[PDB]
């Protein structure tokens, strides 16, 4: 997460770090807990992941260094990538992981609800200039949306759809990037956390007037429940 700020234990209990183990164990992407067995995340995160045997989902994580050998995780039984997903910039950048097991939820590993916006937070781990390294402490930033209409105007030769939703600042400086990818745009609406967008793609990161494009989760609900059963 660019230009954001350290989070704290218990806070974003729907955030998860999705790890690959092969060839070495490391953070791949963010996810959002949505149910017993269901992480929702981005499809472009499985670029050449050919099998779920190498993923691990840790929840109730803040520092990445917390994760040791003996830490509990959820394996991934199935990867369900949108049938129409072929490329991020052209939408459908959504995906679900069916787990081996289910979350015995607590305070720091609860699910988050879907929609049907004003207080919106982008969370995630995300990269640095320098040895393609992953930020250790889960970061957050508050950001507001931009109308697809404005977004569209700021991407003249790619096509923003109704199944996308954009969100930086106009001065720039705050964003979700690679590593954050797949991670939630969570918004508190009538005092309740709904999962509104998924960190998908962008041009630069946190650049002035170049806001992130997030899979507009609202438009895939029915898609999601053809599977959360």
């Amino acid at each position: 997460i660019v230009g954001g700020t350290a989070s704290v234990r218990g806070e974003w209990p729907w955030q998860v770090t999705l790890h690959t183990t092969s060839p070495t164990q490391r953070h791949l992407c963010g996810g959002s807990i949505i149910g017993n067995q269901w992480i929702l995340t981005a499809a472009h995160c499985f670029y050449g992941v050919e099998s779920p045997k190498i993923l691990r989902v840790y929840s109730g994580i803040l520092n990445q260094s917390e994760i040791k050998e003996d830490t509990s995780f959820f394996g991934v039984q199935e990867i369900i990538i949108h049938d129409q997903y072929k490329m991020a910039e052209s939408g459908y950048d959504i995906a679900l992981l069916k787990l081996e097991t289910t979350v015995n939820y607590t305070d720091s590993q609860r699910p988050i609800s879907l929609p049907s916006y004003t207080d919106c937070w982008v969370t995630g781990w995300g990269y640095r200039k320098l040895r393609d390294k992953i930020q250790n402490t889960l970061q957050k930033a508050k950001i507001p949306l931009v109308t697809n209409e404005e977004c569209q105007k700021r991407y003249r030769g790619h096509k923003i759809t109704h199944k996308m939703i954009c969100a930086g600042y106009r001065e720039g400086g705050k964003d979700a990037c690679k590593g954050d990818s797949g991670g939630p745009l969570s918004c508190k609406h009538n005092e309740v956390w709904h999962l509104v967008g998924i960190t998908s793609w962008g041009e630069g990161c946190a650049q002035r007037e170049r806001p992130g494009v997030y899979t507009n989760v609202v438009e895939y609900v029915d898609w999601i429940l053809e599977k959360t059963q």
Partner: antibody
Amino acid sequence: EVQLLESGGGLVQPGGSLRLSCAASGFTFSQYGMDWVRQAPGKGLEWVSGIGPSGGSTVYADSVKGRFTISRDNSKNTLYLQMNSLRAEDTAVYYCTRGGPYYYYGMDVWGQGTTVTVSS
Amino acid sequence: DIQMTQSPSSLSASVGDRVTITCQASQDISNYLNWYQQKPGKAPKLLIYDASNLETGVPSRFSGSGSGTDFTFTISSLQPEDIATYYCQQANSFPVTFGGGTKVEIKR
């Protein structure tokens, strides 16, 4: 378990060459960036160069750039430091280091070191 | 090109005392700052990363703080085994640079 052994140290005339080596063991070498840090006699820690997991992206201290070449091969588990146009200011214990786990860059594993003495 | 000013150069203290070492970066390196212990005869070893994160195996009397430009490394209760030279290091950008080191010795 995790280990870096260096070798090729010793004595070399000024103007000379020397290839240092480091045999990494007990980790998947391929995936980690690596640096040589040295330490001249009584003492000071000085970073010399580094190279990314894959061998592209190499980077050097001003005092050795154009003289030293870092490289690796991952199919033998070995990091190298080709040191040319040596000079007394290069006399030092040379350490092979790993540049940290996925969430930070620093030197999280060091070998025992190997001594290079540039003197005629 | 970033320069690291460590201080003091050497110090002496009795077992049990607070020991505090400082490290100032010539510019904002946020929290990209590591601390190392080198015991006599031995290779340095990494104790603290990212300003305050304490690595595996490191005992709880070590800790660090700072971000931006002023850093501090502290030993809550100095032990005889903590005899060593300690070194800060910015990992903000290349080249990587270290402090001059603080020699830490035991009064007794």
